[PDB]
């Protein structure tokens, strides 16, 4: 049995948005479903759910702001009726929540803001003597000036994960995010091994594969 959330995107404040939870390997008339959210850096908050008999339940704070329905035999919808900036969160759906049958989805990200979508620029953080210490070299990519979240970064198409640090994005005064991803490698490998940061920002349809080489 599995569940998957979808529909998360950027909307301006006041603009209705509908999220969907799609289930596989079980019937909605057999198990309860629940929506939960988490604002960036904050706690889990139960929104509401639908019971076996089809009764819909809301948290008191969520009534009116959210509408939950069985949309099909395999989907449950969550409509955010008049989103505010404070509805910016990851939204999770789950079968159950408490009992042994409990299963969660990976979540879908909602952003509520009047700022517009912007693709990032990707710049190399080139390894040099100024980024070498005792046989270890550091290199990376700077992913600058994007909105909204998220961006993903991987190295060498996912073949390299050890020594990688992808830092939490920071909101710049311009209202745009910036982040860096770094990796520490053996300095003896700088001549032979290719290092490529794979940056993907789906909201702006931006995908960049930047080779990071020692500076000349």
């Amino acid at each position: 049995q599995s569940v998957e959330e979808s529909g998360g995107r950027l909307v301006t404040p006041g603009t209705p948005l509908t999220l969907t939870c799609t289930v596989s390997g079980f019937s909605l008339s057999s198990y309860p479903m629940n929506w939960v959210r988490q604002a960036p850096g904050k706690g889990l908050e139960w929104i509401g759910g639908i019971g076996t008999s089809g009764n819909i339940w809301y948290a008191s704070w969520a009534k009116g702001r959210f509408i939950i329905s069985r949309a099909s035999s395999t989907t449950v919808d969550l409509k955010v009726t008049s989103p505010t900036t404070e509805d910016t969160a990851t939204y999770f759906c789950a079968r159950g929540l408490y009992n042994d049958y409990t299963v969660w989805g990976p979540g879908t990200l909602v952003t509520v803001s009047s700022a517009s979508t912007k693709g990032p620029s990707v710049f190399p953080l080139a390894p040099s003597s100024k980024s070498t210490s005792g046989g270890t070299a550091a290199l990376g990519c700077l992913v600058k000036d994007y909105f909204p979240e998220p961006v993903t970064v991987s190295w060498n198409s996912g073949a390299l994960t050890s020594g990688v640090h992808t830092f939490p994005a920071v909101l710049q005064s311009s209202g745009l995010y910036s982040l860096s991803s770094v990796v520490t490698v053996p300095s003896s490998s700088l001549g032979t091994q290719t290092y490529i940061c794979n940056v993907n920002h789906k909201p702006s349809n931006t995908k960049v594969d930047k080779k990071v080489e020692p500076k000349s």
Partner: protein, 219 residues
């Protein structure tokens, strides 16, 4: 129903014990409909315990839940590096009498080490590609240090910088219990090419003296 977790943050040495308290404003269903969740950064929450004390399938016996009614505890024995997470209690109720479910506010678990680790420090000049765009970003990396408190100071021609840098810190590493930090100094291309020496100075408990990494623009 409101669930209150105390403390909101807790530290244990590897091999030590932590205890997290959950107090509900009203008694959960059947006096034991209380679950504990573990959330590691980037991940959905994992259900560890339900019925106050019953372990979910596959969960370590190092986790012990107890309590009844309104008062509950999670005890983690023999704390390991991979216990680093935020923990949430979840209370469940008769939907006809109260809110069906309510999460506590969360308790962040941090692993402490007796010994400090100095950061490795790296500095990166702006790329030629970025300079073409009219902006210059200089990056200072502090790699794999403990404890979390670290001071990063930017100096440009030996002049202290203020209000033009931002930093970001990783969550505690689940394998070595260390943190990393990036600081980014942002200037216009015009301002960047007015100065020669760019330095990041790092103060940390693991360093006997402040360490400076620097480059000269051009050379």
């Amino acid at each position: 129903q409101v669930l209150t977790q105390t403390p909101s943050s807790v530290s244990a040495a590897v091999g030590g014990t932590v205890t997290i308290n959950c107090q509900a404003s009203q008694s959960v269903y059947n006096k034991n409909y209380l679950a504990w969740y573990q959330q590691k950064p980037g991940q959905p929450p994992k259900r560890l315990i339900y019925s106050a004390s019953t372990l979910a399938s596959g969960v370590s016996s190092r986790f012990k839940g107890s309590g009844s009614g309104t008062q509950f505890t999670l005890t983690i024995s023999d704390v390991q590096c991979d216990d680093v997470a935020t923990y949430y209690c979840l209370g469940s109720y008769d939907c006809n009498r109260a809110e069906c479910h309510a999460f506590g506010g969360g308790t962040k678990v941090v692993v402490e080490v007796r010994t400090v680790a100095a950061p490795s420090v790296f500095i990166f000049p702006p790329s030629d590609e970025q300079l073409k765009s009219g902006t210059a970003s200089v990056v200072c990396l502090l790699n794999n240090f403990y404890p979390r408190e670290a001071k990063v100071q930017w100096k440009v021609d030996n002049a202290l910088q203020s209000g033009n840098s931002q930093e970001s810190v990783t969550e505690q590493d689940s394998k070595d219990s260390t943190y990393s930090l990036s600081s980014t100094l942002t200037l216009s291309k015009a301002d960047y090419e007015k100065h020669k020496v760019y330095a990041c100075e790092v103060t940390h408990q693991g360093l006997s003296s402040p360490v400076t990494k620097s480059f000269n623009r051009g050379e």
